[PDB]
Symmetry: D2
Subunit: 432 residues, 4 copies
Amino acid sequence: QYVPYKVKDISLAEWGRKEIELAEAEMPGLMAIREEYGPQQPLKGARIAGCLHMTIQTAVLIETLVALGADVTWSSCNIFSTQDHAAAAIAAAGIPVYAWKGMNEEEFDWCIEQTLFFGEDRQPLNMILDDGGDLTNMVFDKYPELTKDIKGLSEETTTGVHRLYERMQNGTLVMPAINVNDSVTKSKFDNKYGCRESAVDAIRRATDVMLAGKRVVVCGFGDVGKGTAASFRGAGSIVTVTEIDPICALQAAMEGYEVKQLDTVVDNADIIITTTGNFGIVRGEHFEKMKDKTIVCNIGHFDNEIDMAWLNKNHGATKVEIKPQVDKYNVNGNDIIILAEGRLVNLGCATGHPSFVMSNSFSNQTLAQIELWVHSDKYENKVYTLPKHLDEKVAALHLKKLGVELETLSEEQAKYIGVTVDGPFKPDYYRY
Amino acid sequence: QYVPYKVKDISLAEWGRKEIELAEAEMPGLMAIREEYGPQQPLKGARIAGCLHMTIQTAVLIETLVALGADVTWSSCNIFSTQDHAAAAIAAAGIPVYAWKGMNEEEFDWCIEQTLFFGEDRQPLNMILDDGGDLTNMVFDKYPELTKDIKGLSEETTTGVHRLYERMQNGTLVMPAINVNDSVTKSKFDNKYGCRESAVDAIRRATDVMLAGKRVVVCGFGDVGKGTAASFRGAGSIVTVTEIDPICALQAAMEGYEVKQLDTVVDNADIIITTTGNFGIVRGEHFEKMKDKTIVCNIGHFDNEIDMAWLNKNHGATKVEIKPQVDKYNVNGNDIIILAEGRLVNLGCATGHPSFVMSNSFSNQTLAQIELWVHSDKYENKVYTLPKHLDEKVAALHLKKLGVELETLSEEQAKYIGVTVDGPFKPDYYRY
Amino acid sequence: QYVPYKVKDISLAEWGRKEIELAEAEMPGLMAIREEYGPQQPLKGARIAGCLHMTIQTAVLIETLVALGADVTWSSCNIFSTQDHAAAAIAAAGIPVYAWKGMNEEEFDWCIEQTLFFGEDRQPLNMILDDGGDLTNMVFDKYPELTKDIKGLSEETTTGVHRLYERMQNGTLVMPAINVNDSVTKSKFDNKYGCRESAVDAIRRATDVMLAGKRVVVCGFGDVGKGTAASFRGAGSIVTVTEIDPICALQAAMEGYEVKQLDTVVDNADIIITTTGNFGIVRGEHFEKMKDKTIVCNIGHFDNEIDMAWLNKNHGATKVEIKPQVDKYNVNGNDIIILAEGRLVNLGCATGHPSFVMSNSFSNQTLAQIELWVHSDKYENKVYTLPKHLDEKVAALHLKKLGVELETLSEEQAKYIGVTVDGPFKPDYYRY
Amino acid sequence: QYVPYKVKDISLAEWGRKEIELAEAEMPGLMAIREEYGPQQPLKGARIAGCLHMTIQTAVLIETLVALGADVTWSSCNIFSTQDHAAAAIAAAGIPVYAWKGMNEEEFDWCIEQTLFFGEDRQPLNMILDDGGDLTNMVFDKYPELTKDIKGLSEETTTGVHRLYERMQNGTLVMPAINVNDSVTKSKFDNKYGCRESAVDAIRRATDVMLAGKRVVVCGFGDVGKGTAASFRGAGSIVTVTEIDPICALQAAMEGYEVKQLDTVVDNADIIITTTGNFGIVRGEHFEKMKDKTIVCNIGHFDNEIDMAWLNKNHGATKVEIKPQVDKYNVNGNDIIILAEGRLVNLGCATGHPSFVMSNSFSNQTLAQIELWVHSDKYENKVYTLPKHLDEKVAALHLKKLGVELETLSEEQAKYIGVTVDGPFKPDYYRY
Ligand SMILES: NC(=O)c1ccc[n+]([C@@H]2O[C@H](COP(=O)([O-])OP(=O)(O)OC[C@H]3O[C@@H](n4cnc5c(N)ncnc54)[C@H](O)[C@@H]3O)[C@@H](O)[C@H]2O)c1
Ligand SMILES: NC(=O)c1ccc[n+]([C@@H]2O[C@H](COP(=O)([O-])OP(=O)(O)OC[C@H]3O[C@@H](n4cnc5c(N)ncnc54)[C@H](O)[C@@H]3O)[C@@H](O)[C@H]2O)c1
Ligand SMILES: NC(=O)c1ccc[n+]([C@@H]2O[C@H](COP(=O)([O-])OP(=O)(O)OC[C@H]3O[C@@H](n4cnc5c(N)ncnc54)[C@H](O)[C@@H]3O)[C@@H](O)[C@H]2O)c1
Ligand SMILES: NC(=O)c1ccc[n+]([C@@H]2O[C@H](COP(=O)([O-])OP(=O)(O)OC[C@H]3O[C@@H](n4cnc5c(N)ncnc54)[C@H](O)[C@@H]3O)[C@@H](O)[C@H]2O)c1
Ligand SMILES: Nc1ncnc2c1ncn2[C@@H]1O[C@H](CO)[C@@H](O)[C@H]1O
Ligand SMILES: Nc1ncnc2c1ncn2[C@@H]1O[C@H](CO)[C@@H](O)[C@H]1O
Ligand SMILES: Nc1ncnc2c1ncn2[C@@H]1O[C@H](CO)[C@@H](O)[C@H]1O
Ligand SMILES: Nc1ncnc2c1ncn2[C@@H]1O[C@H](CO)[C@@H](O)[C@H]1O
């Protein structure tokens, strides 16, 4: 039977609403887009299923989509990332949301599947909004009959984008897709500066440990690794980076970090955090070398960066929960502290990124949903990014809140550098 | 009638004990002092009343004093700083503790008064361990008859030390006192690096706001102000400092901060945090100038740095609690967000300093209690500090945990610079 | 008549050679390329005219090209950037170099023109190696008859690349061109980290001023602006950034800088430095507002970022040379200090970037010259970049010198993220 | 016969004067003291011999003393620290100065001895102004007959202060002495922030090496070590600190540096710089372990921190001068680069600290000379410091130049914290 929503505790809605109102003031881009596109109702007729961490920030995105005319259903893309008071507030607003903090895997799948059908009539979704690819996979692999009537999808994160390029190479991408991750105002702000805000936050809330003087190994120096390393360095930690990519490794050395193999530094590390989007970064052989009370955690999208299966099989019998999402294992006499069972730690042990940086990602997300819903016929079954002018517009919408003033080119200065006075200001290859 | 303890929820003890065990590993100085002085039972016969934030870290101090032979009673020195699971664990260990998070002022006084008498026999305390001076004032002002049999007191923080110098000038200091605040390993580590760890932590847990690009006004640039400014700068904030002292102001300018009057910067500040130990820093006239959703908080010892009386009198009728210790007031159309009702915010909205830095303060605290209990007859009714050799010993006890190696002077190098090979290494005027 | 070289003082060669030998040890990429391609003589038959700051670093590039088989002639692309002992050493090695520090504009052109013809026979060049486009313009505009026998050109810097895209749009690019600037290992290392090394260096050598606590306005926050801002911030300055581009402006705010219009901050600035590659950044109206003894300088390619014509016309009569390339003007009673007559200040008042970062740029430059000389027939009269594998190779060649260790993907980890174990590791759109 | 001055080249005076005028604008404290005390001629009758690095900054000090009524003679306290154009300008002003860059030791002593007698009449000095103790030792040890008529001495640096405490313990301090080093506005600004400005400066001018990613070993973490470590960290270097003092070592770990024995890190260091004021820090056994082209230098007062005797005895025969004060030795196949022959490197290879920070030290120096000349009868043959009010006054005189605004206490706020509204604001034990 139809289930209108499912949340941990609907009585948390009042608290969630108070925090949503504060978040709105910190998300000027989303609120400006609400205001500019509200009158036009661009998303009228859309039935968007979203699969994205059910946080206070996501609530503002959800209510922006509704404000633009859409019908929306929602689930979280991680079992530990929902903020229960945010979910309760969205449920109390009449929006079908299926999400709570601490789901098991069967519940996680069940929540996604509820979002595919709208109302008692079970009307199918016609738009996909994804973070990591699990909703995309659910529809494409388990409900392929529905794709004929879905106009397109947007994908929010690096890991889900890679899965979309797997599908292109495999001939299994059956609709247009906009890669929101690689808007400049997403990748270079959310992935990097968002993790700078929220990585140390999660370690502090989980463990309360002193960070100054601790040796922190950051595995990876992509956008998440850059921000995560900066997070700990700004708290006084001594950060060593690992990398496979010689360009990213040289960047870390130029920023004043040592860059070593994990095997070189594992036996003296105080904290190890993975940022790679790969698998098998922290293995049984590494756990066997760690010193007592080493904290191990992951801020990449999936928990398989850390071999939790090995740890639970070999040392799970004497696992002790310190408190929820802070587990202590004993490996041959040395305690190992695992945060959020190896799941993305900033959302699992804290609240993820702050509202202001998520306003950039979610402004891109909203513009992508508009573009697909209105203009999907103009696109092939390939992966696209938003045009640079829209990327620039998203950034510009956040400047007044910060007291940032921009210069204005004269027409002659603009011609001198080969641009127009209203932009775009950079060639499409520019890397910022 | 005698009350053996009073805590919020004794069933939190198991969780508290798990966190105490983790804290012990992060407090090598305290555990080393336990180990060195345990066999000697130096505190046998002592009945120490302590008045100090009832945190996990304080639990390790309490159990160190007991391990050294003392009987101990305890209360918190702030109405919001107790960690209820730490209090429960100490209560379950059989130690008289009277403390919970969120006391009112009548309860705060009642808790202190219970600590003055030991057991059903109501045996009076004979040692004072204080943080801020309220326990000292309670005994000296309200129970003066008890001071004849108290061997001495130690005082942990800058504000309580100043009160002790008031008493010296006033002829009302009636026992020897050791100033633990001004051990180098306390003032220059706890006050500064501890606030670097815990100031931003509290703002994040309370508000989840983005700190990068925010204008943060840090009022004061003493040890707490230096650490607090560093806290926000390391998170990407744009910090402006205020000061009355031209030397401290010049330090802030040399560290790359603007230094302005609060009146110059109040109307564009995103966060204002007071660190002065003074009163009347943030006044009604300042609230009237703040922009919408400015966060105002205090990390000095007492809440009177912010004129909360003015704010509650003039705008309390429409106060909204966002969540506990996060209050929203509307001042002439602009929201003002107050953290922890103006009480010390790192303990009120987070967990205070981390264990490792508190091990330095509490190692000094333990050595001071030993020195007074054993050698109080060798002291006048004046304020003293521990000798530099003990200060150096405290620092040395924390080096191995961090992987710090020290050089050893040859006898000839030691003579060259005028020291002995075992220290002390600096003249008593050295400022570090 | 043929002139074999022209330098300030050939007796500086011994000193130049000693510094070249030290630079070789700091340029592992260039020396590795020498070693790998030396036996193959890939540049046999090439007659490369180079127009690029005649520094110690450029000497190692010149001798690498010769080591690979090329005949080379050389001039500097700026009137103040030659290091006379580097020029003398190259002249003493028998290489035709025409360059000294402090040329006038007629001499600058004369030096370029000598490089176009090789030996007493006046054999024409057949390869162009340019930095800024002035050599390209000299050949294309003044000696167009020579382009038929030139196989291609490489261009090293952002400003010259823009000129190449002007030529493409104008139908005046008559040979293949490789954009070396936008190798990742050039733009994201030289432009950014190189200016971090050398911007403050130049201000210190020129003026010896205290940088801590000074208000520095960095105009622009592209790669040069990012590095320049970091240069001054790391010295304790209080940096404000200006920008036209909302994405770059938001980056600066997220990095903890205020971002304002120059007009907002000009009257209180202590140092103003331009990084834009535009013109007309610092105008007469700005000079009229500056406070006494403000230092004004430019680190973009051309001096027209600052309106030096206005300053010399209106206030040149009382100009005082403090020392060479440090000039003091009096504007309505306030002194203005101009560095290097507004020409790129890191090369004009110091020695430009250090050897290690120039090894990255010049490794790319060498590989580009090889690719064009060997494979120019495979290219159209368009602008190209080197493939990502070569970019990665350049970075990898510099890791051992720094003690950087790289992880190696398993074949299964490589397939998981969609790469091969030997790279390239990132999609072509990746921005680092 | 009497010699009126001795400098390298008097024709450098015009250049020196231009730079002195710029320095005056950067030394508001000295110029304010000139202005306040000029009318009173407090130093009338004084004959001050100064022995202090003959830099542009020292020229402003010299001319301030003359402006206050004193007769002055001067020499430099280091063989490499004189700025010849500063010396020429002072000589051209009619002031007896005996100093040039690159003296030998016999010349160094000869210069000091000329300063002891004034004019053709050979009138003896009656005031000593010293930096390091060599002038003090010259008078006390070689001209003891003169001390009866010298009213007192001031001493500027940590090393000379220690020598004064040696003399107190030895009963050989025969006049009052003011320790200028340990004014707060000297030790905590000059020693620390001055070296932050000038340590990296010297390495860049001498070697032009890339600092990002280099491993720099800073020996010592006193005030000079703190500033020197910050210098290199702000340039992107990876700094490891060495220490004998557990408090200073813990400070470095809390600031995010590794802290190791030199023996642990010597074989992989790129730069080693000594800051201890001790001897025998870098020994033959260390040189034998260094890798090729390691840069070794010293920023403590005396060159014996590095065993230059060992290096010259064992490897001097193949020493190569790269350029003046940059020497290359070959130790068993590895090149070692020595800066300034091991003498204080910021003055030997660059220009020492900038004017603004020296204005703080030299404002203290001027007030100390006034206090001794006027009030020496009120002092014993002991070491004294200036009162805190004068320390605060010195800092306050530099605030307007930086745009620093100070708050003003109300009388009630002042009483609350136990001070007066005009200061002093801190107890005498305060460490800042
Ligand atoms: N938790 C968050 O809030 C958050 C935010 C954004 C993205 N993400 C996720 O974080 C992950 C990383 O994202 P990104 O944008 O930084 O990707 P990225 O491609 O920019 O960076 C990943 C880096 O990992 C490196 N790497 C790969 N395998 C490695 C190995 N074996 N050892 C060391 N380094 C290795 C790569 O060379 C690359 O530089 C993805 O899973 C992404 O979805 C999480
Ligand atoms: N929350 C914590 O964990 C924590 C830690 C240590 C100390 N403390 C408390 O914090 C406070 C500050 O301690 P501290 O050690 O930094 O003291 P401090 O004396 O070193 O610094 C206080 C600073 O405030 C400045 N100041 C005074 N009045 C001012 C005003 N009107 N405007 C601007 N600046 C002003 C003073 O000049 C001084 O530099 C005290 O109340 C102390 O007990 C709290
Ligand atoms: N001196 C050096 O060693 C060195 C090194 C590399 C490049 N360069 C030169 O430096 C210049 C900048 O190079 P880049 O790679 O940073 O280019 P870029 O395109 O990455 O950055 C230039 C920035 O200037 C900004 N800008 C343009 N007009 C502006 C204005 N009126 N006000 C404020 N900002 C404005 C643009 O938005 C852009 O972000 C070029 O001339 C380049 O050739 C010099
Ligand atoms: N070059 C400059 O401009 C400049 C400026 C100020 C002072 N100085 C000189 O620099 C030196 C240091 O001055 P300071 O004020 O920092 O003194 P300081 O006493 O504050 O610091 C010296 C530090 O060296 C440490 N140390 C001693 N022997 C050591 C060893 N064997 N290994 C490691 N660490 C060791 C000590 O523990 C101490 O912390 C003195 O010679 C002083 O005169 C130079
Ligand atoms: N507070 C948050 N709310 C929603 N999504 C978030 C939050 N913090 C991080 N994320 C997102 O989580 C993704 C990782 O799956 C990142 O792409 C990032 O955009
Ligand atoms: N976690 C903590 N436990 C106990 N005391 C703390 C903690 N964090 C800060 N403090 C103390 O609170 C005092 C302020 O009253 C400071 O002197 C500091 O030592
Ligand atoms: N030391 C140096 N030698 C040669 N070129 C340099 C040096 N420092 C900077 N440059 C170059 O100058 C160019 C600006 O015209 C930049 O692209 C950069 O590569
Ligand atoms: N530019 C300078 N002029 C004069 N003295 C200086 C300069 N830079 C550093 N010093 C001084 O050199 C001393 C070391 O002998 C330090 O105490 C410091 O005050």
